[PDB]
Amino acid sequence: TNQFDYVKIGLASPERIRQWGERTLPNGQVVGEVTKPETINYRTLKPEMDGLFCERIFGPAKDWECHCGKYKRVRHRGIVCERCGVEVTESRVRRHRMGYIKLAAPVAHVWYLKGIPSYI
Amino acid sequence: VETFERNKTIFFPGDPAERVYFLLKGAVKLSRVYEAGEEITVALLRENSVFGVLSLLTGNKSDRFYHAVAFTPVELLSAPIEQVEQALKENPELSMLMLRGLSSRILQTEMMIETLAHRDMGSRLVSFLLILCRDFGVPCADGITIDLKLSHQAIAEAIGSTRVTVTRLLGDLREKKMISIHKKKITVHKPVTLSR
Amino acid sequence: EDSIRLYLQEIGRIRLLRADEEIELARKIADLLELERVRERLSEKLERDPRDSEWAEAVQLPLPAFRYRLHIGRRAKDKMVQSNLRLVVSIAKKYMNRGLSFQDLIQEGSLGLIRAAEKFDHEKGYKFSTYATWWIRQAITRAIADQSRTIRLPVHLYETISRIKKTTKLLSQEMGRKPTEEEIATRMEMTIEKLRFIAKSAQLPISLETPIGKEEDSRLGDFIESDGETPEDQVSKNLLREDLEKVLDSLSPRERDVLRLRYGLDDGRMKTLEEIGQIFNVTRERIRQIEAKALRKLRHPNRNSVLKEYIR
Amino acid sequence: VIPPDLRPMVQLDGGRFATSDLNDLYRRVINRNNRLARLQEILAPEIIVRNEKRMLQEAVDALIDNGRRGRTVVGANNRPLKSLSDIIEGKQGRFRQNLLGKRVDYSGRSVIVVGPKLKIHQCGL
């Protein structure tokens, strides 16, 4: 209730879009982007490492478990995985991260486009 | 044929699965619990044989009032209370069987009796030491030793000891002549003879 | 907006050719091809790439005529890959129904088309129709198998599976409905364990919302829960916490700290007695003693008999 | 790109899985993209690459809103997929049904019957 008053409808400029999934790490090098369209692996089921379910950019589905491994407990929380760059933070951190695709080509938003007035 | 490991308990007080058991093998010593602390084991068994009279003390409403112990890697069987209830309700022999096993745990007590709470912490330590060699002993050359991999202070439960197990026993180990050790072994040399 | 056609029209309006016509090419293409791998050789040796000028080739050339030579050399391929266009669609379309998507295919081929389009040698005379189409096919298959499945599986296994299907069908011939499995393993080389695995392994997922069935009233997945847990558990637990807390927290408050330090009751499992011994007040002979002491204390009836019911 | 789980995807008991059209539209556009980058990388002659973009374009598109303009995507669901828009639209857009109308617990239904003997302001139960 006392967290905010009014909402601010608007648009997401490419910075703001890319500002939906940066998750820059302390290795210092940014992420949030997904370099794979596939989903969980066939052998095991784990989330590749750059696909639609990459943990290191959304979050460790297995609560405090670097996709890499090494840590399987809240004990390891703020600390992340060197080797995987998984952001160890429970799992509710997911469902909220966002990531994004640098586009190899622009796309006239369907909405602005075939809209009733086709604002474009 | 239930069982556990060298570092476990069979149960607590308060825990109502109190029917006569059947230590199939290993000691599975039971550590009768206490208020603040300090638990005798007292109980200590053999093949096949029973322990934990429960549905038998205050009827089937008895509280063990004595925590238990999976002393060595256990091996323990049990039986549906009926065996010591219905199946026991039958011919005496049936009950007698359990009573004979109870008499074993009883004999056990008598064995501790006198040997335990004797007076000295050395004589006493030996009063049942030879006894021990007669229970899980291992005869080998020197003579009828145990060999089981053990403390200095589980031992203390033998006396109320602190370093006696690692100090006084050393005597029997060499200065006094009665046993020897292999990292954590016991070589009772003898039934009596030297050190008597 | 046919898209398929919207491109299909147009490609029409580029017209087909013949070996001879596609021969002037071949040479030119090679003339450009190799030229570059100069460009790479000079790359790799140095500055990582000639990639300057007439020296962007080590070769000699009046520079303008270089870029020109390049243009004609590769323009041949461009004026060839597209020059073909059709036939590849006759191929790709066979996988337009196999999976992926007519357009999706088309591309893939195209990719191939290229590659072939240049890995290709008019010295063996026979037309690319008996070689270009090779590479195509390849390309393609590696797409509906490389994806079109939303859970990538070992494209190799795909074949094994098929191979099994055929081989098992042979068994079925003799042993109808190939009930043989481990006997099929005498020809399957592996326990049905993997055969059945393969079966499931080769499953295509479900929309999560196909409308349910026996009633169009609702999608699927709307009868399950997330990785979360019902409060019923949450609470019980949290009870545990405190239940404990107090119940512990009624014997030696200091030691109680280590009870949470060398253990949990917070966020270490742990602080190895080592570190812990000194953590509270620097100690070596005052730790596992009070440790067991604490346990046996809160152990035994009246004490442990409080978690006796809340063993959570 | 949506935080994954909302496009959740899920093991189903029988082993089968519960794919979500979200990750699907998506993944599509991924390929198309990548590939296209590889097309300009291979400097393919336009009209492919051209074509291509065109596609991409509307992959994207459909993602946003299927069936809006070009040909409604229809995947293994053997029906139009479910674009980003529409899951928050209609009678069942998020709005109107999970959101003004959620589906609480601490409840109980039943048939009903006259409760004589029991007075008003009372109920059986």
From Swiss-Prot, chain B:
Residue intervals of the HTH crp-type domain: 119-192
What domain of life?
Bacteria
Q: What is this protein called?
A: Global nitrogen regulator
Transcription found in the keyword field: yes
Query: The organism's lineage?
Result: Bacteria, Bacillati, Cyanobacteriota, Cyanophyceae, Nostocales
Name the DNA-binding segment ranges.
152-171
Q: Which UniProt keywords apply?
A: Activator, DNA-binding, Transcription, Transcription regulation
A Pfam family cross-referenced in the UniProt record is HTH_Crp_2
Q: What does this protein do?
A: Required for full expression of proteins subject to ammonium repression. Transcriptional activator of genes subject to nitrogen control.
MF-aspect GO terms: DNA binding; DNA-binding transcription factor activity
Where does it sit, as one GO cellular component term? cytosol
UniProtKB/Swiss-Prot annotation, chain C:
State where it is primarily located. cytoplasm
One GO MF term on file is: sigma factor activity
Residue span of motif Interaction with polymerase core subunit RpoC: 104-107
Instruction: Give the start-end ranges of region Sigma-70 factor domain-4.
Output: 247-300
Q: Which residues bind DNA?
A: 273-292
Location in or out of the cell: Cytoplasm
A single BP term in Gene Ontology = DNA-templated transcription initiation
| Region ranges (Sigma-70 factor domain-3) | 159-234
GO cellular component annotations of the record: cytoplasm
The protein's role, per its UniProt record: Sigma factors are initiation factors that promote the attachment of RNA polymerase to specific initiation sites and are then released. This sigma factor is the primary sigma factor during exponential growth.
The protein depicted here goes by the name RNA polymerase sigma factor SigA
* Source organism per UniProt: Nostoc sp. (strain PCC 7120 / SAG 25.82 / UTEX 2576)
Curated annotation (Swiss-Prot), chain D:
Q: Which domain of life is it from?
A: Bacteria
UniProt lists the family membership as follows: Belongs to the RNA polymerase beta' chain family. RpoC1 subfamily.
Task performed by this protein = DNA-dependent RNA polymerase catalyzes the transcription of DNA into RNA using the four ribonucleoside triphosphates as substrates.
Subunit relationships: In cyanobacteria the RNAP catalytic core is composed of 2 alpha, 1 beta, 1 beta', 1 gamma and 1 omega subunit. When a sigma factor is associated with the core the holoenzyme is formed, which can initiate transcription.
Q: What is this protein called?
A: DNA-directed RNA polymerase subunit gamma
- What is the organism field in this record? Nostoc sp. (strain PCC 7120 / SAG 25.82 / UTEX 2576)
The root-end lineage is:
Bacteria, Bacillati, Cyanobacteriota, Cyanophyceae, Nostocales
